[PDB]
Amino acid sequence: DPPPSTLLKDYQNVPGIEKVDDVVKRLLSLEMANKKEMLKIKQEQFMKKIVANPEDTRSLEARIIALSVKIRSYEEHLEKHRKDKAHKRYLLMSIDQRKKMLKNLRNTNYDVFEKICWGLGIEYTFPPLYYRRAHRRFVTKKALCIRVFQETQKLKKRRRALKAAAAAQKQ
Amino acid sequence: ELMAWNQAENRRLHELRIARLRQEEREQEQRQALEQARKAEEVQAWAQRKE
Amino acid sequence: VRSSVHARWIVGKVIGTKMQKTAKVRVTRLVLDPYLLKYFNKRKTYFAHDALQQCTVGDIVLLRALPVPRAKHVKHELAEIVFKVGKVIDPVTGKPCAGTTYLESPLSSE
Amino acid sequence: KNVLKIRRRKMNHHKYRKLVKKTRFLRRKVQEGRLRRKQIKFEKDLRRIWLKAGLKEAPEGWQTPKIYLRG
Amino acid sequence: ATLNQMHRLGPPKRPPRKLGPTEGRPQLKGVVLCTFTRK
Amino acid sequence: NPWVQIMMFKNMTPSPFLRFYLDSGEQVLVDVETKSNKEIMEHIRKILGKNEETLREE
RNA sequence: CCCCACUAUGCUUAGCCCUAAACCUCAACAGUUAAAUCAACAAAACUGCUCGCCAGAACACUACGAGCCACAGCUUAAAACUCAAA
RNA sequence: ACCACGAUCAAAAGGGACAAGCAUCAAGCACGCAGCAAUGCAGCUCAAAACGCUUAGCCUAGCCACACCCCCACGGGAAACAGCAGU
Ligand SMILES: NC(=O)c1ccc[n+]([C@@H]2O[C@H](COP(=O)([O-])OP(=O)(O)OC[C@H]3O[C@@H](n4cnc5c(N)ncnc54)[C@H](O)[C@@H]3O)[C@@H](O)[C@H]2O)c1
């Protein structure tokens, strides 16, 4: 998070803000503001770090960064409010909307898609091909079918050496 | 002969495209000039209010 | 020029790269619905040999038939990547584009 | 509108709930037996797999769990 | 329904016709077991 | 042309175009921006369509 | 049904259960007010587009199967016999 | 006739296409790829219907299948009209 002494986004570029009294600096800092003001500073930090034009807020990159800041705020909210179903819905919807943005950015501008992933620390994931419950019967059977495959592979390798050994003896 | 005629038709359409794009930059630059002026006044006004 | 493979040239979208030197490509064709007389996409999967493993999931590729299949399901090789995913080059102008917008103007090189 | 269709459904559901109430001990014995057969049918399906693959016994360390018991 | 839905579902499937008491046959041979009257 | 694969692509580039792939390996790019649908059909008929004589013979 | 008393329960906490006449009984989005205004009533009549759903009644918010922290449960959901209606 | 350095006809093999009903058959369980090999990777099919059950000879100048049964027919059961007439 930005330091609490950080000035608000509105008062950072006023001339003479560095020569005012310390009390005036406290009143124009993040310490004396609500959390939404800290999120505006975070968004601007990511914009300058990632996007080519930090002032283009309608680009697909800026929307991903803006929504990524909202997503992080919901996660912090839900860390303290674990039964807040309203904000849990907002988080899951926001993650889905960003994935749609990342999908559309990956298809149109891959170089920018890579910088967004590195800058925001997003590991893009491709969606599953099928949506179907993995119930107990399927989970148990799939595990058995993998064990059976693993055992068959071992037996097939012990039928390569014995055949190899016998062939050498003939010579 | 038909492939060469098609390559020539594409070059003709490209010359029209380059002419069309030049006329759009002149218009884009005019708009971009006004928007910057308007945006500068709105910033100076906002900056004065904060100051 | 002869080949035992039915599909000689096909365009498709890469949907898998988990096999070594093989790209899984979804090819769609238009098929007429006899009752509705409307065309609907019909998709088929083709394995394509990708020696340099240059195919990425989502890019449009052109596949060429091999003289004889090289594997049970590999009957084609990658002939050309038509549209690299997120790195499309406009064929009409040769300039890079991001969707319907140019990344470099055609007026740069006149 | 009238509620005559709801009334038909109402009586059907009342009589069903009452029927289940009267026979809840027989139905519980029947349900127990079905779950046993369901478990046996499941164990057979897994045994078919390793036997059709050439193995003579279950994979080393494999115990088929009871996936239908209340526990 | 939409065209996409009509395509996806396909042409309607008739219910398999229900054979009657003759089992889809014109006549059947029978052996009389008992006679009686019905109201 | 039931055996010719036709694949469509939306909003991938700034301008619309047709591209034909021939068995020889040649590619035919047809720029269609600013052209009406009737002119597009007449264009590809000229460069890649069978003439009326070839069809009469068949 | 009326009167009195009192319990589970209504509350909190942590887990479940996953139903409602959960109903504006009006699916989402976009568009129109000119055509014929329009079976009726409801709530003026429609167009585009998409998904979901329906195909006589009753059997049936049932049977069987499958899934589920549900075990007198929920979800999905038939058939036979019967009728000329509903 | 023979050579056919071919034509015709047409197997095997390879690629593609190809019935109906049921999704209360939803997962299949090795179904993939690379490599000369050794061997390595862990993949392949599937709600655009895989896998499965049931039904049915088919697209009729005709075609497919079968030929007492065990899909096959070394072998076995057993002793064969689904050739014509006939019972
Ligand atoms: N089943 C899938 O995993 C899947 C995959 C791709 C596309 N779809 C699309 O979903 C729609 C429903 O398909 P259906 O009628 O075969 O399924 P369905 O509604 O009968 O549901 C059967 C299975 O598919 C899942 N499913 C249902 N709706 C889905 C949806 N919209 N997207 C993804 N999974 C869904 C269900 O959870 C269940 O596992 C169709 O438009 C289909 O093209 C489904």
Ligand SMILES: [K+]
């Ligand atoms: K209501």
Ligand SMILES: [K+]
């Ligand atoms: K036989």
Ligand SMILES: [Mg+2]
């Ligand atoms: Mg009743």
Ligand SMILES: [Mg+2]
């Ligand atoms: Mg109390």
Ligand SMILES: [Mg+2]
């Ligand atoms: Mg209270």
Ligand SMILES: [Mg+2]
């Ligand atoms: Mg309500």
Ligand SMILES: [Mg+2]
């Ligand atoms: Mg909807």
Ligand SMILES: [Mg+2]
């Ligand atoms: Mg009915």
Ligand SMILES: [Mg+2]
């Ligand atoms: Mg109910």
Ligand SMILES: [Mg+2]
């Ligand atoms: Mg029930």
Ligand SMILES: [Mg+2]
């Ligand atoms: Mg049951």
Ligand SMILES: [Mg+2]
């Ligand atoms: Mg053959």
Ligand SMILES: [Mg+2]
């Ligand atoms: Mg379904």
Ligand SMILES: [Mg+2]
């Ligand atoms: Mg059933």
Ligand SMILES: [Mg+2]
């Ligand atoms: Mg038969």
Ligand SMILES: [Mg+2]
């Ligand atoms: Mg006989």
